[model samples]
Target: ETWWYNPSIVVHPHWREFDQVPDAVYYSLGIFIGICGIIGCGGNGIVIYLFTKTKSLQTPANMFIINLAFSDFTFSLVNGFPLMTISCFLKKWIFGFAACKVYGFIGGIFGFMSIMTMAMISIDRYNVIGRPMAASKKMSHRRAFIMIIFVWLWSVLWAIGPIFGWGAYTLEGVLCNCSFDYISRDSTTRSNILCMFILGFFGPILIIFFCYFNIVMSVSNHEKEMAAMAKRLNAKELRKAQAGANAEMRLAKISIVIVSQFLLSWSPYAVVALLAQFGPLEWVTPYAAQLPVMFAKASAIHNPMIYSVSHPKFREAISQTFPWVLTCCQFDDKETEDDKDAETEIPAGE
Candidate 1:
């Protein structure tokens, strides 16, 4: 008899009782997640490496990023590889019941930590981009470390919720991975998840939208002010300055895109969790559930992507630290200055 047949182990309605998952499906998805572990670890490892060695990369703005890298690296280390190993080889969850709880707990901690850091990062960007005056004194590395702890502290509170039986941890999705008990239709799980849903999803999303909305408005407002200044320079300038007025819509449009990008990787899991708990039971299956489980883990890979492609200073620091990094990644400070100039001059040019 398998573990589910034994009276000692409590089974979930969705795990074994929902459907008996195929062994072949387990191997297929296990291989899928194994690659996530490799890339997430490798990519975030370089991010953590640069922050550790490069003094130039150390600044108030970058403190949040380093903590993000650290959070991802450990999450990939602990959650990613273990899931792949158990599903592909063992074909069952062999780790004792205690181990399953801890496994789910780490995913909650690191993933929520990622979400909180992203919200805090928006506040930092808002200070520099929206307020502009307090760029000098918004946050320091010393106080930023305290901010990191504050985000970290709340995430652990939710992570430990399962251990205390406010929620639960159980094997899920082809018997390879563990997750907070979302499928069990009970009063305890239903109530506990609402508190988590507020803290874990709704609150951070609200913070991101509020900050980015103001960021869009501030930049647009500044452009209008500068356009008005140009009119003071010449009485003829008033007729040509429609450019500033037209861009308010575009600014709001692009702010939505940036805001959606942050939510893309994490939102699907929330959808699945909701589906399992309240929506159609027939629609939720091992295969259907596995994708969101893996997709949530894929969130760890994006910060490394964000740093490598878009962050000019980080690219420059990495190049200087490692001379072998080809010329393409090298960014000139003059180019950064020029970029800022071009951005501010757009209204005047129009």
Candidate 2:
């Protein structure tokens, strides 16, 4: 008699579990996971340190940056770091059921909060710079802090629903890291997933995109107005006017970069997530699902690089923290004068 026919005999589906996972896939995943944890944690930590240690860098705008850095750093610490390690090494979740729920909730909160804060930053900058006549109406530290508090509260509201049975946490994708339960076809899960797609993803995308469009438009119009004025002025006045336009455009370009990076990083994952949750099950292949997640994970490092290194003031602050390095770019007196001149001429709103 074959052992398979014996009462005590047992067989397992080993090929079913491991056949689709290529060797190259595992190696690539390990590298990606390691980089996301090491670089993301290190970069965001530096951003937080720069904002906290440097008193001069603690403006309201910088406070928003600090909040973003904190959220990203926390997410990487709480979720990304651990999940990636387990996924890469163990190839399964050894942490049990309770830990999975906690991981999913924490991931949801910080992920949503980070995007929300980016939206806030874009709108705040637009109000201050794009409509400078209304700069007085722009965000103050108190108001900014209030907005941040609301962001956290809103994230918590969505994240905690899983615990109450509106949604759930479970292992997902090839690596089986804990996340929002996308595989469940229940009404509650579908509703929660749809809500997240609409409110958490698209809502912020629309707001940030709208704000960025307006910012670019306002700056361009201002530049055109300045150019028109320059055509009627003397040579020296023309040069000064051109300098002012250049300064404003430079600022506008920086704003564009911030908005673009965010949209680009998150949009792919947002689309993938929606498709996974709602699309035909066949479309959700392991590689198809995993690529978008890696893109989203990379977003943790982008903000710190953009906000800190690109801005002269932030670079200066970081330089002060590490005097041995010469990373900060020195702005000339002329650039400073141009910035002042551009600020003075921003048109009053209706």
Candidate 3:
């Protein structure tokens, strides 16, 4: 018999009962996630299409856009939409065991990829704007391709490995579920997950913070450099024309949007995950169990707005798509200036 089947079965070590998942909880998940699916998928679809359609939107910073859009699109299409639709109506895992495993695995992969992409974007900005000379070499399309493949490979390896063996899965009551399988019951698996949580999630978060901090410092330094340059320069027109401008301000704006959303969207889950590890409730904590689930679903919700608000090309593509929305919201010309600036500025962090 499996370890979970034994009399000493430790199902939900932190929650009141491992088997007792509240329907009300899933109901709320469905409603919230359902909204995410509609908005995220719609917005990301526009971004993807606009990216393919417009040549100007393609750049080094744009590479991060593609990566993030790809991850969010997958999340909405493969994870959020499907999971919400399935879990909400059926209220059980009608999808067979294999499907369940695949679903869970894909969820983990996309979620991990999204986090990684956000961190990478932060690094990109830090290099492009903060340490411009270090990143002067233009990145080729071939390299971007290789980088994307590598990112996908890493994500798949982490997510799929658990499904093969390292984790646990079973038909507990009505649900045939596959998860990280650390009830804190199997000491080894529990320890491994704890390490993974730190390395995979927390480590990336630290990278994000450090990268952004470096970017902020660089921005300040650049400003000071400009101020000093202004003092030395005798020509007032050039100073007036180029003052306070070290790089495209839009890239900075986009970085802020991506970092902000990534933090806002994922922070709830991250906090809960950390607390679950050591909180009074412990591993079986119902809140912890739901954190990943909610995080998975939130992807479908946030991606669209980020693109709409941050990426002008993407936002315009959607406005063009629906036309009526265009009537309501006029296109901003500042985006054009941003685009021109982006073309002249070397890749972020490059």
Candidate 4:
């Protein structure tokens, strides 16, 4: 009979009359996002544990991977669907103004950090695959940690700008969670919105896209040259070389899979964000605003899929870590860890 959100609390001055939406809708959103948070948290938790504890999985390159998992894990704990779900069921923002600011700030930090780490991963992949000779030296953990520190500082810079009044944060969507004030129509807030799209999302995505394109092309040309050489070799040697090429193909495919996931998970939400920031205001229905956020929430879950489930190394680590759980999903035959490191670490004789 009554709206799920408290009627007593003031929503935004420009708030639409989405309170008329059925109570069942709010109930469903709570359950849906709550489930997403739980899955994201558990998956990333496993990813961090395995990567840290498993000696073989620890490498400079994997530092970025663990960092990505950590950010997503922390993001899930902070701005995740669990907290928002609680507010959803309560029919209002139970935590009040200060908590909302903290929630939105943490969202910005972890969200940007995740994208930046992926960008860092892309650069290291390009170096290993495209410039194997330099990559052969194997950058030290100190160098990797330096870049990791840079990623964090950059993320904090962008997130903090809004706190100092370059932008604003408040509850958005009918579900009532804190986020950057994209819905507001003003130059001050719009500045942060545009800058975030340009700096945070677009910039890092361009780096990822560029790296993947170069890596796939580099791998393609390398395979063709090997194929030509294989044509002149005996059947046994030919088979060996071709199989190596196949492994290289999948390694590149991992980059493609990760790049594609990042695009798919965040692009829709980016579209909705842009529409809200600059497009016709009326077009952003309550569902329109909220659904894309749901997709963004789902992005928090994409990390483990790329880094854990599909990855052979981490897959084995997971099996080792949790022997009690039955795994229905299985991997195809795995090559020696040495061969994989050779493929990804530095090319043979390159």
Candidate 1 per-residue lDDT over residues 84-193, each given as its tens digit: 56645667666767677777888888877877877777676666555532231355877788888888997887667878988898777766677788887789888878
lDDT of 2 by residue, 129-209 (tens): 566332314568898889889888877877777878988876555544556766667899998888777787677778777
For candidate 3, give the lDDT of residue 279.
62
Candidate 3: C-alpha lDDT: 0.59
**Ranking 1 against 3 by TM-score, winner:** 1
Which lDDT value does model 1 have at 194? Answer: 83
Please give the TM-score that candidate 3 achieves against the real structure.
Answer: 0.77
lDDT of each: 0.68, 0.66, 0.59, 0.72
lDDT, candidate 3, 1-350, per-residue tens: 22223232233433324554567766666666666777777777767677766766666556766777778877776555665456554555455656656666766677778777777666666665656433433445776666677667767766665666666433222232334554444565555566556655676688787977776777767666656655765344433325224334455567677667666766675555445445644443555556555664565456556556555666556566655545545657664554454345433333
Off by over 4 Å in 1: 2-9, 18-22, 132-137, 225-262, 321-350
Ranking by TM-score: 4, 1, 2, 3
TM-score of each: 0.81, 0.79, 0.77, 0.85
lDDT of 4: 0.72
> lDDT ranking from best to worst?
4, 1, 2, 3
Per-model tally of clashing residue pairs: 0, 0, 13, 2
